[PDB]
Design a binder for this molecule. Sequence first.
Ligand SMILES: CC(=O)N[C@H]1[C@H]([C@H](O)[C@H](O)CO)O[C@@](OC[C@H]2O[C@@H](O[C@H]3[C@H](O)[C@@H](O)[C@H](O)O[C@@H]3CO)[C@H](O)[C@@H](O)[C@H]2O)(C(=O)O)C[C@@H]1O
Length: 130
Amino acid sequence: PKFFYIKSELNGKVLDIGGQNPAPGSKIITWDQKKGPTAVNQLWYTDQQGVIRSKLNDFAIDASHEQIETQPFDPNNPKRAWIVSGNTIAQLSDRDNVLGVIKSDKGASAHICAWKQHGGPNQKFIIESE
Ligand SMILES: CC(=O)N[C@H]1[C@H]([C@H](O)[C@H](O)CO)O[C@@](OC[C@H]2O[C@@H](O[C@H]3[C@H](O)[C@@H](O)[C@H](O)O[C@@H]3CO)[C@H](O)[C@@H](O)[C@H]2O)(C(=O)O)C[C@@H]1O
């Protein structure tokens, strides 16, 4: 219902499920903000507890692998509980661990990782209502 974009303060692009792939394990990148029907893979919402889910498949953000990917939500997996805290997307169980944008080294789209808060814009995001 209440959807929003998560925009990076590093490049101005938004969290986006690469190629709108609905399958679990799909990498989340930053891509030009889209508007209209096709923007679904860039739209997110928070469940009751405040955990971020994707409008595309209701999957959560997961940081179990090298780069963040979408995965079905699991209340027992600390790596799948991410919330909006100020201008940071922080881990529910560790506010010091936050998402950050890392530009591609091979001309690809930027990807996202989770690591200790270091105050730069790469770890800052703006929540934009749909
Ligand atoms: C190898 C490759 O295909 N690289 C492209 C990359 C991949 O397709 C995705 O990472 C697969 O998950 O997508 C890039 O663009 C991202 C945007 O894709 C848009 O959809 C594309 C789709 O990805 C293309 O494969 C398809 O041919 O056209 C679709 C529509 O243009 C999404 O709509 C958009 O939100 C982004 O996710 C990328 O940079 O990752 C382009 C790579 O060349």
